[PDB]
Enzyme design. Structure first.
Site, PDB file in Angstrom:
ATOM      1  N   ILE A 130      -4.383  35.559 -25.527  1.00 59.71           N
ATOM      2  CA  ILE A 130      -4.282  35.371 -24.259  1.00 59.71           C
ATOM      3  C   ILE A 130      -3.051  35.565 -23.382  1.00 59.71           C
ATOM      4  O   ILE A 130      -3.054  35.366 -22.447  1.00 59.71           O
ATOM      5  CB  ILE A 130      -4.894  33.587 -23.975  1.00 59.71           C
ATOM      6  CG1 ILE A 130      -6.358  33.156 -24.499  1.00 59.71           C
ATOM      7  CG2 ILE A 130      -4.823  33.115 -22.985  1.00 59.71           C
ATOM      8  CD1 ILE A 130      -7.825  33.778 -23.747  1.00 59.71           C
ATOM      9  N   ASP A 167       6.087  33.387 -31.680  1.00 59.91           N
ATOM     10  CA  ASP A 167       4.205  33.526 -33.162  1.00 59.91           C
ATOM     11  C   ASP A 167       4.657  34.157 -34.264  1.00 59.91           C
ATOM     12  O   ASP A 167       5.607  34.974 -34.766  1.00 59.91           O
ATOM     13  CB  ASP A 167       3.210  34.224 -32.358  1.00 59.91           C
ATOM     14  CG  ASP A 167       2.010  34.525 -32.868  1.00 59.91           C
ATOM     15  OD1 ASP A 167       1.290  34.743 -33.746  1.00 59.91           O
ATOM     16  OD2 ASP A 167       0.705  33.861 -31.687  1.00 59.91           O
ATOM     17  N   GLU A 211     -13.168  14.888 -24.320  1.00 58.27           N
ATOM     18  CA  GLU A 211     -13.455  15.457 -23.033  1.00 58.27           C
ATOM     19  C   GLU A 211     -14.987  14.820 -22.930  1.00 58.27           C
ATOM     20  O   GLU A 211     -16.291  14.977 -23.871  1.00 58.27           O
ATOM     21  CB  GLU A 211     -13.781  16.748 -23.492  1.00 58.27           C
ATOM     22  CG  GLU A 211     -11.895  17.371 -23.156  1.00 58.27           C
ATOM     23  CD  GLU A 211     -12.376  19.301 -23.499  1.00 58.27           C
ATOM     24  OE1 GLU A 211     -13.679  19.856 -23.587  1.00 58.27           O
ATOM     25  OE2 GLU A 211     -11.071  19.584 -23.407  1.00 58.27           O
ATOM     26  N   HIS A 271     -11.729  21.360 -18.527  1.00 58.34           N
ATOM     27  CA  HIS A 271     -11.902  22.791 -19.291  1.00 58.34           C
ATOM     28  C   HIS A 271     -12.781  23.872 -18.414  1.00 58.34           C
ATOM     29  O   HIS A 271     -14.075  24.009 -19.118  1.00 58.34           O
ATOM     30  CB  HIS A 271     -12.390  22.373 -20.690  1.00 58.34           C
ATOM     31  CG  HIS A 271     -12.656  22.788 -21.916  1.00 58.34           C
ATOM     32  ND1 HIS A 271     -12.441  22.581 -22.841  1.00 58.34           N
ATOM     33  CD2 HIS A 271     -12.518  24.461 -21.891  1.00 58.34           C
ATOM     34  CE1 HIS A 271     -12.300  23.260 -24.062  1.00 58.34           C
ATOM     35  NE2 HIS A 271     -12.262  24.730 -23.265  1.00 58.34           N
ATOM     36  N   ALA A 274     -12.820  28.706 -19.364  1.00 59.19           N
ATOM     37  CA  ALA A 274     -13.692  29.762 -19.695  1.00 59.19           C
ATOM     38  C   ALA A 274     -15.198  30.770 -18.879  1.00 59.19           C
ATOM     39  O   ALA A 274     -15.709  31.026 -17.787  1.00 59.19           O
ATOM     40  CB  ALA A 274     -14.663  29.870 -21.261  1.00 59.19           C
TER      41      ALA A 274
HETATM   42  C1  LIG Z   1       3.033  26.241 -35.976  1.00 61.88           C
HETATM   43  C2  LIG Z   1       2.263  27.763 -35.481  1.00 61.88           C
HETATM   44  C3  LIG Z   1       0.698  28.092 -35.891  1.00 61.88           C
HETATM   45  C4  LIG Z   1       0.751  29.526 -35.081  1.00 61.88           C
HETATM   46  C5  LIG Z   1       1.028  29.502 -33.669  1.00 61.88           C
HETATM   47  C6  LIG Z   1       0.172  30.794 -33.512  1.00 61.88           C
HETATM   48  C7  LIG Z   1      -0.440  31.245 -34.020  1.00 61.88           C
HETATM   49  C8  LIG Z   1      -2.011  32.283 -34.097  1.00 61.88           C
HETATM   50  O1  LIG Z   1      -2.661  31.842 -34.851  1.00 61.88           O
HETATM   51  N1  LIG Z   1      -1.217  33.749 -33.921  1.00 61.88           N
HETATM   52  C9  LIG Z   1      -2.818  34.419 -33.400  1.00 61.88           C
HETATM   53  C10 LIG Z   1      -2.225  35.807 -32.762  1.00 61.88           C
HETATM   54  O2  LIG Z   1      -1.162  35.578 -33.542  1.00 61.88           O
HETATM   55  C11 LIG Z   1      -3.509  33.981 -32.479  1.00 61.88           C
HETATM   56  C12 LIG Z   1      -4.983  33.769 -32.833  1.00 61.88           C
HETATM   57  C13 LIG Z   1      -5.769  32.957 -31.877  1.00 61.88           C
HETATM   58  C14 LIG Z   1      -5.578  32.439 -30.890  1.00 61.88           C
HETATM   59  S1  LIG Z   1      -6.183  31.349 -29.921  1.00 61.88           S
HETATM   60  O3  LIG Z   1      -7.318  31.172 -30.398  1.00 61.88           O
HETATM   61  O4  LIG Z   1      -5.847  30.560 -28.747  1.00 61.88           O
HETATM   62  C15 LIG Z   1      -6.808  32.831 -27.982  1.00 61.88           C
HETATM   63  C16 LIG Z   1      -5.650  33.605 -28.657  1.00 61.88           C
HETATM   64  O5  LIG Z   1      -5.117  33.716 -27.609  1.00 61.88           O
HETATM   65  O6  LIG Z   1      -5.993  34.803 -28.588  1.00 61.88           O
HETATM   66  C17 LIG Z   1      -4.160  32.170 -30.516  1.00 61.88           C
HETATM   67  C18 LIG Z   1      -3.216  33.304 -31.454  1.00 61.88           C
HETATM   68  N2  LIG Z   1      -0.402  30.268 -35.307  1.00 61.88           N
HETATM   69  C19 LIG Z   1      -1.185  30.053 -36.371  1.00 61.88           C
HETATM   70  C20 LIG Z   1       2.720  29.567 -33.375  1.00 61.88           C
HETATM   71 CL1  LIG Z   1       3.143  29.756 -32.088  1.00 61.88          CL
HETATM   72  C21 LIG Z   1       2.690  27.828 -33.901  1.00 61.88           C
HETATM   73 CL2  LIG Z   1       4.396  27.577 -33.217  1.00 61.88          CL
END
Ligand SMILES: Cc1cc2c(cc(C(=O)N[C@H](CO)c3ccc(S(=O)(=O)CC(=O)O)cc3)n2C)c(Cl)c1Cl
Ligand SMILES: Cc1cc2c(cc(C(=O)N[C@H](CO)c3ccc(S(=O)(=O)CC(=O)O)cc3)n2C)c(Cl)c1Cl
Lengths: 204, 210
Positions: free
Chosen positions: A56, A75, A165, A183, A186
């Protein structure tokens, strides 16, 4: 992956914070013609912060780059090299808050991502910041968000997702500076068809 | 000086295109009314859809480049701009009559002249796709207001986004009040950045005389 619809809504929410299109539409339906009230801001040359650089987050980045917006973010997984390929300069969280004009969240819902935008975080932000949450409810602390909107620390908020929600606490959605959707991230004929089809290829 | 407000008009158009596709003002009004309607505000994904841009000056070319990042097919018409010059900024030019059946979205960026007045008429809407969405952030009267209402009431036009009107404020509220119409009080140029640019560019011209 099954993403582009959540990214398009987020981009559409950004354009709504800059010009207050929903507020201007509601004003028109009331028979008003308020030019002075809805004087907005240009997106060209403004800094957008993208917390969460997954599927996204990168699509939002490329779309908002064509508007002349500066795309920066964070990230923990995504390397600086991967983010540099789609034009996102990765910096530590504390260096992102003061430079941002617009902030959008695209991380999964996790205890570590819960309250990512809090009172301490909002205080580090630039005065008059605009916040988008088309990811999951709880990423932006709703209590801290209303306080920043009250003080003017946050000029506007576009919220598609909430902790509950439908939400019972109407203070956020009722606020004049808040854009809302039930929401709809999607909610497209094209994404729901892809989500329904992609669940079969992972099965076999 | 039209150059000074060109980027603000281009951005609002893009904003109006997103608002028609995901019904953002309608969703906000429903939420502000204390309602939660998920399977009522059914949106459409802009990726792969065709956007027709009638008028390829400064605003027309800036709308195209922004909507191109959304994977929108940008087609259009301008009798002054050549098909080779339009191709340099991603706009495939085809004769005006061929544009109508290929469009999902139509946006007007022409000046107000007798030739441009009533460009979107009953004969024009009849050649369009059933469920077309129309954006008018240029001058009131390019899209015939009477023809637009007929198209919105028959289902020929699924939705309209109007920043401009023949009368400002409009005396007739039949268009403004329609459920599939989103509107603004001529906000196209209403931004600090465009107002300061237009304000500076007009001042230097007055100084240029001496
Ligand atoms: C504290 C902290 C922890 C964080 C992040 C970012 C992730 C993360 O998981 N990143 C991966 C991409 O590497 C990811 C995977 C799925 C989605 S999602 O399911 O929303 C749909 C999508 O966007 O594809 C979004 C992002 N984590 C664990 C940030 Cl920024 C902070 Cl500050
Ligand atoms: C019948 C007919 C006649 C038309 C057009 C197009 C023009 C025209 O004048 N084009 C030039 C650019 O070549 C131009 C100049 C200034 C603006 S502007 O910035 O004032 C408005 C805006 O961009 O919103 C927009 C466009 N003419 C005379 C079309 Cl399409 C049709 Cl069908």
């Amino acid at each position: 992956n099954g993403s582009l619809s959540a990214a398009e809504l987020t981009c559409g929410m950004i354009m709504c914070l800059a010009r207050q299109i929903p507020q201007a539409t509601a004003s028109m339906k009331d028979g008003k013609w308020e030019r002075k009230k809805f004087m907005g801001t240009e997106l060209n040359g403004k800094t957008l912060g993208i917390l969460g650089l997954g599927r996204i987050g990168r699509e939002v980045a490329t779309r908002m780059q064509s508007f002349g917006m500066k795309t920066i973010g964070y990230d923990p997984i995504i390397s600086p090299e991967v983010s540099a390929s789609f034009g996102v300069q990765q910096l530590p969280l504390e260096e992102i808050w003061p430079l941002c004009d617009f902030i959008t969240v695209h991380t999964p819902l996790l205890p570590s991502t819960t309250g990512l935008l809090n009172d301490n975080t909002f205080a580090q932000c630039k005065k008059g910041v605009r916040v988008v949450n088309c990811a999951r409810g709880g990423i932006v602390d709703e209590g801290a968000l209303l306080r920043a909107l009250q003080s003017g620390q946050c000029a506007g908020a576009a919220l598609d997702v909430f902790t509950e929600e439908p939400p019972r606490d109407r203070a956020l959605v009722d606020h004049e500076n808040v854009i809302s959707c039930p929401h709809l991230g999607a909610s497209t004929k094209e994404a729901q068809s892809r989500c329904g089809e992609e669940i079969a290829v992972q099965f076999v």
